Symmetry: C2
Subunit: 197 residues, 2 copies
Amino acid sequence: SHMYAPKLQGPVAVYTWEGNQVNITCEVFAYPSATISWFRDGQLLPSSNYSNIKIYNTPSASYLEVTPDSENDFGNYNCTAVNRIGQESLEFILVQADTPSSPSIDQVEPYSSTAQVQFDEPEATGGVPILKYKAEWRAVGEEVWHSKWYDAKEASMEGIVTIVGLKPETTYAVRLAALNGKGLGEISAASEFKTQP
Amino acid sequence: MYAPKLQGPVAVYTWEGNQVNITCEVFAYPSATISWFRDGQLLPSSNYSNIKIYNTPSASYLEVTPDSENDFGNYNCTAVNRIGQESLEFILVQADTPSSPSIDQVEPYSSTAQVQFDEPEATGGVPILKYKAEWRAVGEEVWHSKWYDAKEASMEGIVTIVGLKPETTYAVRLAALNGKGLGEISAASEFKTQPVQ
């Protein structure tokens, strides 16, 4: 049967935030079967410098499970596979996610004691999924913000969050932020609207 | 706290008897539990010995070894935590062999020729492992052949054929091998070797 040097594939970049496990995928096709080693800065992993790492091997892929603790844990990692015929390496970048960019408020439609805030999702998730939205509102000329959190799926599927407990004939400012696993993102500018009588 | 959010490639490729992992990455707090389904059956099942589940903190992997055409198609990942539930569907695609390479040029010498080609437009979903070239003198019966690791063939998309006779017209054609098997043979390309002196 057909022998060949290992052929590797997997994503270019993998995103996470400090303290959060993520797996880097190294899929391998080789005959005869290959031995897979993971490297960073020339050393086999886990190493002294990169110690927050476990490897999960399966017949079709090796997974490097990395839990970054510091800035230095982000950067390039290498999967190398070796068999009788030769070797191949694939380089991955572990990227530090950002929090999301700001949602944009499109329109606010006030509905006695409530308001429907129509919004556009952040232009950038920061590399990991948006999990929730936070809305904050306050009557114009108050300092204290009221807030409510919304699941990101329900919110994004209609592009609306509904704000509640509003007083009639009152001008409010409302602003919106998106939360991903790393934390809360940039908060939108506040938009003003007035509730009905 | 939020209901689970799930991520992963929609389509996963393999051929009968070959294990592949379907990846379901999960973001949830509190931690979620992933369940897998195939044609309404909750896995693992005595009904499905060709399927193993490999869990890691950040992702569950369904290791499937298709034993028949009936094993391809949809698999569903679901995740549940205290807050809610999410599901993501995957398609396990049966890989094809590669489409045909295309021969662009042959640079002939006297007893050898360099054959330049474009790789198959479609790999069939699993990587190309090797190439097979075949060639035949215009008046002879046998197609001669040679195999090449795609690692070398793929560097320039050039392979060298050898054992040719001078001042002789040949056809050459090429096919690519992947894990599923040997793909479509290219259209033949005509060339003539240089004369002696």
